[PDB]
Amino acid sequence: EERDIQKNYWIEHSADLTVEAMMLDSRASDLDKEERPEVLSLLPPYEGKSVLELGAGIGRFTGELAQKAGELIALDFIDNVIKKNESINGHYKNVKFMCADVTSPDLKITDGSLDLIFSNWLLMYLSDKEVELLAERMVGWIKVGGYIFFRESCFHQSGDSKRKSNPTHYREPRFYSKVFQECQTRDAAGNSFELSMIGCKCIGAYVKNKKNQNQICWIWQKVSSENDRGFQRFLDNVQYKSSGILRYERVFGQGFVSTGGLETTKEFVEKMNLKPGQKVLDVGCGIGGGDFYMAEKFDVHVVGIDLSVNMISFALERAIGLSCSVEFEVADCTTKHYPDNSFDVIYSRDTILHIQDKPALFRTFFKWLKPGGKVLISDYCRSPKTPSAEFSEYIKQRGYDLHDVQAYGQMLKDAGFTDVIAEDRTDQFMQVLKRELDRVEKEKEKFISDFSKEDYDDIVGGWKSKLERCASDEQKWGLFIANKN
Ligand SMILES: Nc1ncnc2c1ncn2[C@@H]1O[C@H](CSCC[C@H](N)C(=O)O)[C@@H](O)[C@H]1O
Numbered sequence: 001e002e003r004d005i006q007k008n009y010w011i012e013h014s015a016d017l018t019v020e021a022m023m024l025d026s027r028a029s030d031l032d033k034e035e036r037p038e039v040l041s042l043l044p045p046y047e048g049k050s051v052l053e054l055g056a057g058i059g060r061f062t063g064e065l066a067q068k069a070g071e072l073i074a075l076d077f078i079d080n081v082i083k084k085n086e087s088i089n090g091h092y093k094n095v096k097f098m099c100a101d102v103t104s105p106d107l108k109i110t111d112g113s114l115d116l117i118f119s120n121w122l123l124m125y126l127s128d129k130e131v132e133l134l135a136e137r138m139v140g141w142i143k144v145g146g147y148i149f150f151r152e153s154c155f156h157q158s159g160d161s162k163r164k165s166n167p168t169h170y171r172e173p174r175f176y177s178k179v180f181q182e183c184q185t186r187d188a189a190g191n192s193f194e195l196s197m198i199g200c201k202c203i204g205a206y207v208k209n210k211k212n213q214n215q216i217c218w219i220w221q222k223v224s225s226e227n228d229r230g231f232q233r234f235l236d237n238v239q240y241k242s243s244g245i246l247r248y249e250r251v252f253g254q255g256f257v258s259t260g261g262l263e264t265t266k267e268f269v270e271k272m273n274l275k276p277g278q279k280v281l282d283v284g285c286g287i288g289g290g291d292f293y294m295a296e297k298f299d300v301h302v303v304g305i306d307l308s309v310n311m312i313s314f315a316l317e318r319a320i321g322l323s324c325s326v327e328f329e330v331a332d333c334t335t336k337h338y339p340d341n342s343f344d345v346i347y348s349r350d351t352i353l354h355i356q357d358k359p360a361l362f363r364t365f366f367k368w369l370k371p372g373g374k375v376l377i378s379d380y381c382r383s384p385k386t387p388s389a390e391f392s393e394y395i396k397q398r399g400y401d402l403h404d405v406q407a408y409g410q411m412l413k414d415a416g417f418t419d420v421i422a423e424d425r426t427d428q429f430m431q432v433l434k435r436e437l438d439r440v441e442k443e444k445e446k447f448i449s450d451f452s453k454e455d456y457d458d459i460v461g462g463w464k465s466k467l468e469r470c471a472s473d474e475q476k477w478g479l480f481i482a483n484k485n
Pocket residue numbers: 006010014022054055056057058059060061075076077078081100101102103119120121122125
């Protein structure tokens with residue numbers, strides 16, 4: 001049924017075979033004039049390379065692409081439309097034209113043959129499943145080092161034209177970020193590949209003309225993928241499933257997934273003495289609230305990494321249109337490489353409990369920090385006492401690696417850091433837990449409506465259990481600060 005309703009929409013809106021008919025907007029001409037060159041300027045390098053254009057239409061871009069590309073395939077599922085394209089651009093000897101549906105089980109494209117797959121409005125005309133299947137196909141079609149560009153209306157309809165029916169999917173940007181980042185291929189020799197997100201941004205011509213930032217494009221590059229992705233999947237499927245992230249955010253505060261939300265962030269960031277132009281690495285950046293805060297308040301550049309595809313998908317969505325200097329990447333902090341002496345500050349909030357080999361991580365932090373730089377970490381810890389049975393079960397289910405506060409400080413000293421401060425902030429942690437829990441209980445009706453009774457009970461139960469384990473001299477919270485001399 002999806003194929004029928006989507007094709008019928010394009011049969012109707014292709015009948016006139018004009019740019020205006022495609023644009024579905026009263027200011028089609030001016031939008032085209034301003035946005036066409038912008039899209040072209042955003043494409044990754046493809047001169048002399050092999051390009052596939054999906055949903056080419058009557059050919060707004062096809063002619064331009066043909067002038068640069070070594071080889072071009074222009075594809076559309078409306079035969080009349082691709083015929084019109086060919087009537088105009090067929091004189092380019094390097095262009096092949098196809099009438100095909102990108103979702104077809106019979107569509108044949110040779111794996112590892114393409115340098116760029118380009119579309120501009122396409123995935124919004126596919127079902128969720130169709131997008132997932134096509135994304136995986138696309139990763140196979142491009143060579144390692146090749147690129148994918150796509151652009152969609154997100155959130156809601158952009159154009160002002162009257163439409164009797166409309167099957168378009170207006171998605172949140174995080175859907176596209178997640179689906180493409182989740183793709184994985186493996187060749188017959190056993191080598192694994194995935195995409196790296198090169199850029200994601202809104203189209204300026206539409207911000208200027210339509211006063212909204214819903215026209216969003218993505219650029220991805222196919223790269224070698226050497227790490228097993230099992231732990232990433234555990235994060236995205238269990239503790240940090242999207243609903244888990246959103247319910248945690250409700251408790252902790254907008255933009256945060258850890259202790260105290262903005263309040264603790266303001267307190268800890270102050271200790272950094274951030275100066276304009278400095279560069280901060282945020283290890284475990286989550287949904288980005290602390291990064292936006294540092295960048296906006298202090299005029300620093302923040303490099304944020306997080307292993308969770310869900311987390312980064314949220315962060316990239318929330319970063320759209322912002323003037324502050326932040327970049328986000330899906331990466332494992334235990335395998336990621338940076339040059340020595342890259343960062344003024346390394347910052348991490350309640351993330352390193354997920355890391356099993358902290359000494360190895362801290363030795364890397366020592367290298368990555370500039371001389372004179374600072375490391376600031378908050379993290380879950382334990383008493384030097386042996387954990388109770390209940391505390392041990394919590395630790396096991398979460399997969400946490402917990403140490404006592406003194407020992408954690410010692411690991412920083414052993415990694416080479418100077419003037420290590422290791423503060424037991426468990427009393428503050430308990431005060432924060434109570435405030436967070438009291439707010440949830442007070443706003444119970446709104447919480448259950450937005451989430452569920454189960455979600456509410458999970459959060460209330462989890463916070464009460466933390467209060468108990470903290471009161472009982474078991475679970476701890478530490479703040480650690482040190483310098484590289
Ligand atoms: N499943 C599908 N397979 C192939 N083409 C499709 C398709 N779904 C939509 N299309 C085509 O995608 C185009 C979207 S309109 C944009 C056309 C062009 N990318 C440009 O920006 O000018 C339409 O021409 C439509 O017919």
